[model samples]
Target: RGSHMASDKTLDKQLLTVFTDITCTEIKNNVTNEQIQALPDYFVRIAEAVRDNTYDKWEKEFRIRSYEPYSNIAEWADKLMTKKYSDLDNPTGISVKAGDDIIVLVGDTYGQNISMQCIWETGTEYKQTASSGDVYMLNPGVNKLTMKGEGQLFVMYNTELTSNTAKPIKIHIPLGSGTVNGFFDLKEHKTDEKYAELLKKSTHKYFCIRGEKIMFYFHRNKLLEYVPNNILSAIHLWDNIVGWQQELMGIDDVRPSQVNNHLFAISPEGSYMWASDYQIGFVYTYLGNILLEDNVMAAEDNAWGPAHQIGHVHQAAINWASSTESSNNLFSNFIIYKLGKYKSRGNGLGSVATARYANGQAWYNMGDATHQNEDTETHMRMNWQLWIYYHRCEYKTDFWQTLFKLMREVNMTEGEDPGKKQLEFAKMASKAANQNLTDFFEMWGFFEPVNTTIEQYGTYKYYVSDAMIREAKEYMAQFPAPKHAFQYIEDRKKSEFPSNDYRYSAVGDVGYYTQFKENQKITKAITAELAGRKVSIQNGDEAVAFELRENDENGKLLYFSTFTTFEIPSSILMVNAKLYAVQADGKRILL
Candidate 1:
């Protein structure tokens, strides 16, 4: 987004980047094609893909925002560049004149591999190739001038920047557009332990506060008053929460470089709940801000709101395991329980789990079936984490973290049948909770017994809860501070203390990052294009051959149906490959 800050004269290095006007925007649910066209080409293209996915055709109104608001020239630039961070650790403004041994580290520690086109003003072009933390030092050729000619050097991101990078790289205003942060788990560029240590030191840059520093960017046209600082601190608070979550799970925190510790907490100013739905909630839009009848009028529901929103990031996108709102809330309430922020009666001081225990019902909750004609069915869709919370409290275990770890390992999406996926999901779920959850899910309505019609057990139901709210309140009075996992880890002191193995990341087709990982470009397409240009394939030695279908997706690499194969051909030009897969609903996933 700051490439415009560069010129042919001399780059203070800080201003030297290949990215162009990389702005980021979020709009309300009802999208008009005309409005999409009205946006910048970047966002326009993104909307055609993203906004359309969130459309609600029903003729009714709900609340959300037209776009995320921005405040202060406070133009956020952290995490936009692979190097840029705060004012202090910003790309040094040192003059890196032509022919200097200036080393430029490129590629995401957890991003893609591709050859960026560096065109010199003099018409000479050079290739800048790097891939997932290749540790490649891009050299702007010395002794004079090729990759560094006299005029402007334009670096190209193939308009694919949003999908390839790890963070939400957005351009503030005027030229608004930014990419969704890539969070497939395996960070090629792992964080340094020392940086984790310094993160406790304080450094505030406009919208961010780095106790040592973890940058946050809040979008607002202006801060109304005292509430803004709290907004800043809340984002900072989640860093510790997410950090410890990942630490316990042994997941590598995706820190690209030493200074790139950023959290783009752009909690947009909206009067009602927006960007909280399943489809786009994961889009990383301004989170947890609702125009409640609360004090701030319309801001993040204070720290509790942003805390819930921040937890959204921790909820992994398990393709088949759908637990939308509940998963993130579990993280949210996890914070509320340990730190005491008070979110909902379901969480916060009194928990749904404790409520369940007081009711004399053991592990299971009767799922609601109102949608199936009044309360006979189960409401087990999302609140499964409530059960995980019970284990956290009663059993003194941390199954939630294990669930995050086993999602990739268990491969729940292997089979597509909704009924079957639930069974498969049980494998991951059981191992995650460290208990046999098969019978539990069955009670929740996955399997049927010979007798069938057990009503609560065999029948399906509209999900989410019970006189649960009542019990939640009842439990709170008894135990103001029930034990939480974070505090448990703190006391154990063996958290860095329990240290799980993160060196091994998932590398199969079942998870995200499969396109970039366990994988390349040009492997297929050895045969050709399909108008939109999909790669084709051939079995061992068949002549008629096979072409990638309209439903299939590709890059230089090939992905068609469930079959994925690869090969590297002899070629002169270097090939930086990536892959893609198209979901049944028309959305595509990049590898």
Candidate 2:
């Protein structure tokens, strides 16, 4: 595409000054190359036709970004503009009248520092002491004044204040670095990729701009140019980031304030860059990706990338949706649905996710009857289907907000298995939800946490009673039966068995173990196990169990490969038992 003109400027005879913005197509059709280049400022002014507007949508995002810690760029904007300017000058001063303002640059010339002075046309004088990047107002109460730096300092004045747009100053060698208000710091000694070291070692380091937590970066390499407009997109997302996540997750408590406020993002080798959660966040982004969503998470859900990463930085172990990768994946789908990429942001009543229905399947966290033995850990199938149940049964954000605080009351013991931490998770969940959630969490395959909570934290400052649990379970019973019967392993004390051999260890012992060799061609093993067992039709009246050997050295003992105790009618199972011996590893043994 041909470059678009940014503003209207009229051509003039002034030396090195380009004017009169005109249509590019019209200029190409009418103006000759020599005639256009005749203007002294033509080379510098031409860039305006290519640079787009920055901060155009900043206001819209800031208000909607986060809930707890407000990243209000609008408030920051006024303070930034106090010294902001878009025009530049040489050592020989430009003329100014009363109430005028201009900056005298005293250093960074040819990689050296210098000083400057200013005087009125009639000789009222002012001298500079430091290169502190400070601002000064010219001729506040006096007459005409002129600034001078002998060719060492460059003056930056707000050209747009004189006109409607900025009057840019010419470049000043390898030291021509521009500053944007609110950008963050930089770092390089983090990796030894060699090329990155080369990239940082620049003698004539020009054309550069990048970001920190809330800021982006840019560097001028001639071959590469990351304009301010491109950085604006991410700035927009970050401004609104904290608020968007808070609205979705509703956690009132957050990380230490100063820790996450500052961040860094630099150039990467390609269009794909990644982030690290160390010290809040850091990004290695390709210059052209433009949208950080690619580097972080989604498209319509553009904010998801940074949102997800920052959430990791928060590292609140509130159980389920907030822990583990597989755990977060299920929850992330919920966040993406609400944030974007899917229309699940809302239906008609307004919402996020509960059941998380997707890919023709339903996934659940605290599942109903259909979930059987799975939470976010259960990864295979149509997504868990409790969205409707969750949206209707819970308050907008109270439970999650309560859960976040309650999770902090206790933690996994120093030597405890991570899996056992789930035991502690149950008590907090019950207090957060104001109901006995232990039974439901058990259904979802989590062992009951051992810790008892003495402190009450949330809307209802007490543990859920039996009445609340019965009411909650009664409402949950409306759904269908869960697919798999949950099984938690406890050691089966038997060890020696000659019946278990190579045929069993390599695969598994389905219904055959003790007498598998004696009755290798019949259904005797299943028949003996079922001899006195009671069965129920609700579970298909079937009896299924597995015997596992805790030690792998047992050689022939199928290592804990037993099915859950699901009941099915023996008549239906007896005929099939003769033809197929089902094992713990899901292998079918032909009898």
Candidate 3:
């Protein structure tokens, strides 16, 4: 049967919708009216080429003459439009410091009683012998703090709590680290009037708190609490009642506050971490350790997180009180490798999710959290918005940029006859067009059979049809544009950090703020130990010249780097390692 022909009107409608769906002021301002008008013609030309079996020829000519100039213009437009759009009306309702080192709770006796049992990172815990209304003073270097009690307790670190009989005693975390944004979400526990007052007085710091059913923002010592809030926007309090099975994995749970660089929350079900950028309100969710949504590349392993499952990487640890693992494995090993470049590959390479695993091998493309199910309809919707936004906002052009790239990269006609290659490539492109991108499982199903049977049936003889692509485009046309979420950080008096705990210096972990910087000192010591014993590279540069040093609170190590790829001839043995697991007896098992 012959392929379905796309009419000029049809092509124009598709092109217009795709382009206008993501267009903003920056794009409109950068591109001339004439250039905007000419866009439809560009799509029309591509469609015509596809229809007439001249796509390869047209593509070659277009790449040389049109693609670069257009791509450059589009890229320029995108750069100009780098700023993300935000709304003043529905701003991020929470504000607080950025780090997860401390959590403060203020509520009635029931609230305090329940919170007292919650586990905190070692060295970050606070024990008050004085009654609730008493003032508490902490020594210097007390980096992490958690306050939970019904009785009003005033707190100050390395400084006396200002004695004011007129008001209930208060706690003050001295200005050591630059004031960062903070967050709190709850159902059973609530912030009392004194806590509210404390938040209001801290004009420099912002905090986001969610009560039983609503969320509120405390900024500039004032509550910017939005009225008529929706429960969907609230934190995953329902998880407390029913467990982590109902966690909602989307932008709703995690969004930036009006005063911090970031706001993050674990999904109600604890599937992943939902984080939002304070500057742009850009939301991202991470499953396992891989960042699935963002353009940046990262790798993750089986990091324990907020989820009950072993592989989740949510903001909080597992919350089930009855579970055996909950009390022990409170912290998750969150490892991420920030890539220097973008790598696009349909077929992923090596390991369960990376090259680091013992079961390291090329993984099937379908798993590893890229696919979506019924529960993540909203998550999928936002993913589409971001995907479209990245291409349109960053490229300022149509999806054709990716489509062409995909076509060229996936040349089905590779190594075929020149005459037949053109036909095969067009067929492949046509089939590829407008497929249901949101449904990864469905997409996998469609390709698996054809790809698997190709060797046996021959590539050209295997299932090949244009109807699939046409049907896919039609399905994709129904995907709507996402509503813009606001990013509104409150203006605050900037101050230098007393220590390197805050975002201003290093992005170190909570307990070890100064560890990375301290590592530099350790590196010097190691360098001295290795004095005059440096190895030389191929170019005669000393091995010390290519050595990389990394320090943590645990210790420091030397990592050798070469200009070219390399491998260690010897095995690596981990030192000072302790391995423990939860056995069937619900006790720590050392093997």
| CA error at residue 81 for candidate 1, angstroms | 24
lDDT of 2 by residue, 1-591 (tens): 236855433332221132222211112333444655564343333423223232223211211111112122222212211111111112121222334333222211222222223322111242211112222333211112232221112232321122322223222111111111111112311222322332343222222222223333233352133332233444445534544444334432332221122232333323333333212222233443343535434343344444445444333354332133333332444455454444221111001111221111122222332323343224311111122122222222355545545554553321233333444554555555555543235333343222222211111111334454445455434443322221211111112223343212222212222222122232333432333333211221122233222222222222122232322222222321232233322233322
Write model 3 residue lDDT over 1-591, tens digit each, in one string: 136865544433444332332111012223334544555453434334433455443122212110000011122112211111111111112122333223232211111111112111111242211111212233211123443322211121111112221122121222221232333334322444433433443333234444332233322222333212222222332222112211221122212111101122221212233222211111112221221222122322222222223212221121111111221121111111012232111111111112212222111112222211111211112212222232323322333333334444443332232223323223333333333232222222222222112121122222323454444445454553211110000011113233432222221111121221122111111111121333222321111112222332223212222221222213322344222211111122221
- Candidate 2: misplaced stretches above 4 Å? 1-213, 217-228, 246-308, 319-323, 343-396, 411-417, 448-591
lDDT of 1 by residue, 273-306 (tens): 2222111111112333321124322322454455
Q: TM-scores across all candidates?
A: 0.35, 0.34, 0.18
User: Worst ten-residue run, lDDT, model 3?
Assistant: 485-494
Candidate 2 yields a Cα-based lDDT of 0.29
Q: Give per-residue lDDT, candidate 1, residue 263.
A: 36
RMSD of each: 29.3, 19.7, 30.8
List the global CA lDDT of all models: 0.29, 0.29, 0.24
Q: What is the clash count for each candidate, in the order shown?
A: 30, 54, 25
